[PDB]
Amino acid sequence: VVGTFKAKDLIVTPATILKEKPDPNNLVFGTVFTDHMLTVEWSSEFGWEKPHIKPLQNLSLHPGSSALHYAVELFEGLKAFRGVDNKIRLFQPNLNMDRMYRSAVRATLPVFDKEELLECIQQLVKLDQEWVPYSTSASLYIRPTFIGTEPSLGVKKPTKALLFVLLSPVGPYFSSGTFNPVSLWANPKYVRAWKGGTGDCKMGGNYGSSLFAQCEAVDNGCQQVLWLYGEDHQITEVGTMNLFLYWINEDGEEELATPPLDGIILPGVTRRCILDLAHQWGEFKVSERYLTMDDLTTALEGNRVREMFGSGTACVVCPVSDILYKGETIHIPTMENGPKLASRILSKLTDIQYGREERDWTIVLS
Amino acid sequence: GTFKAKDLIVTPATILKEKPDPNNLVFGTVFTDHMLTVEWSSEFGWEKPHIKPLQNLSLHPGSSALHYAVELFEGLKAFRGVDNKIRLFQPNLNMDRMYRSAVRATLPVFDKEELLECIQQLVKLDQEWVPYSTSASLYIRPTFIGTEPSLGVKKPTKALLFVLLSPVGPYFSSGTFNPVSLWANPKYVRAWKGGTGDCKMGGNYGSSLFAQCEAVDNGCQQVLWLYGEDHQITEVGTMNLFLYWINEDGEEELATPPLDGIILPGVTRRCILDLAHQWGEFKVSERYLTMDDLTTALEGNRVREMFGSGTACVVCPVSDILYKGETIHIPTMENGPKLASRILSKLTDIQYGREERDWTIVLS
């Protein structure tokens, strides 16, 4: 019936008692939640209900809900930043709405009007705007979440769903607020995602399967998993981050390389932004290309590697110092090379996020 | 550690729901009066198990089951016998598989015997829901979810184990073989080497819905899951795949894909392999089967039967595969189907207590 919900229909139930804000320098990522959340119910029978902004509450779900049985679920991750000018900005949020819509279609969750969801998210951040931290090293994490709630054990396209948005204040990625280079666990026994799978979507099913390898990484003194793919051991992603390699390539050219979007790579907003910046600067070759462990070890032997880093909303730029592979520790000289490019990218993205320079990539809160 | 069945806290419902007509049941849509719930935390371990009225779950919206598919499930049945004794069927294999799935999911381990006793006590309390029909059964859905209120992608420090009961009818309303048409599109891959395809983890299923919709759009009832450059035939929807044929060496053979990481080790699959091995009437091979193997065999009139196996269907004969724009006929229904019928008769006779078997347990 109701094709899609509208921000103009928002029903706002303000909280009576507002919670004390956390210290932005003693925050664990995604553990502290703001006063309010967005919820929107859908059914096949009646379509989208009116959207609600209401106090953070537990969800009341039928125990047969397909999100709990068949991972009929997806999420997004984007941030609000309090600028040096005290204006709150979103960063490329229409890219998150596009990616969420694409994920919903592949999940068989009901489609929604992307502009109306973004306006609902803006109104939620506006209401909880004092949760956007007063710190140029902290931000407000925005977690749109979309779950199948049909009370049927049939493996089927859902006839009931809930779209909701949580807000979580977060500090710097590492407590130190400076580059803490990560050690990676590279075990080809595990595969994050495969050709013909859903690795290019933020569907919950891609993450539950990763926890065992992450635990093995921590057991072996590593902070993140290096996700290897195929007989040639392609390096694909670092934990929940896109993978960048800054090196002299096989042709002796200075190059920033990242795996191509061939179906096993999550198309990161950060990844997109870094490729755009590197293209704009025009100071070295920019290549979306396959990179193997043998490519990397051959390059290290030839002193051709400068930097390796992950990219993502949570870290921005996460330098890599070491990879544990085939029972050996392989040193990556990222931190002995500045890291010049990683630092330059972090400085440029944070200058844009916190309004130190104007950009088409930011929207001031409505 | 573990919860213990001896600690069960039973809160009976004071209002009972009307039992459904056993001949008008939609699979997994009707739920019984009671459920099992058991809370876990890293801090305190397993809480006492509860049998209480079916209720909504109250979950923190940050629960890792909702964000990162930190979840697994099982599927097994209780059957009201011809002698009116309620029986479970190979339930220890479900407990083994659930335990193994929990380890792969990084959910907390539990005592398999304690969970089975808790399930028996739940079915016993709701035993009148086990249908009065030799074509209907009580579906048992153990479910295990991460309830950590954290957006970190991490091993959960909070979890809920629960069990739902759902009365269900025959797989097809007719209660006779309705052979399935399969949609074979290699662009979709159910599972990969180094993934979780050999575990009943929720994450393996959410990704499948789009392909299932495409199957139904093209007049097919199930997806044929193809893998690799050679187009291995792996599974049929949520069922293991059996091929009864004359193999390349001219030998009568029952073939099924091997457990190399992309196959869910079905209880029904296990039972069928056990029966075929016991009978000793033909070769039994856990081997790769490709679309080219199958079409070469069909061209040589070497195929007898193809069927899916699973708790829901038992034996699901396959009549056709839509592949590369061609409808490929499988002569299953023109060959009896003799083996499919024999397997269905044997397993249903055991389930409904028409013959004694080590595979069944009479309810606690």
Ligand SMILES: CNC(=O)c1ccn2c(N3C(=O)CC(C(F)(F)F)=NC3=O)c(-c3ccccn3)nc2c1
């Ligand atoms: C072996 N371990 C892994 O490979 C691993 C994987 C993911 N990780 C994250 N992490 C999320 O938890 C969530 C997250 C998204 F996408 F939700 F924002 N991004 C992420 O980087 C973090 C993290 C996140 C935020 C702040 C500090 N640390 N650390 C890891 C480690």
Ligand SMILES: CNC(=O)c1ccn2c(N3C(=O)CC(C(F)(F)F)=NC3=O)c(-c3ccccn3)nc2c1
């Ligand atoms: C393109 N479509 C597919 O490939 C497809 C997939 C799974 N399917 C099931 N089905 C579950 O829905 C659930 C289920 C488990 F495992 F939970 F018991 N088994 C299952 O066979 C059913 C079904 C189940 C019970 C009764 C009648 N029909 N039909 C399909 C079709």
Ligand SMILES: *Cc1c(COP(=O)(O)O)cnc(C)c1O
């Ligand atoms: C979210 C995510 C990324 C990073 O995407 P951003 O939009 O830059 O936050 C990378 N890899 C995986 C697997 C992800 O889920």
Ligand SMILES: *Cc1c(COP(=O)(O)O)cnc(C)c1O
């Ligand atoms: C559950 C399941 C089966 C069948 O298992 P049974 O124990 O026989 O019910 C087959 N394949 C997949 C993918 C499954 O999830």
Ligand SMILES: [Mg+2]
């Ligand atoms: Mg519109």
Ligand SMILES: [Mg+2]
């Ligand atoms: Mg041929």
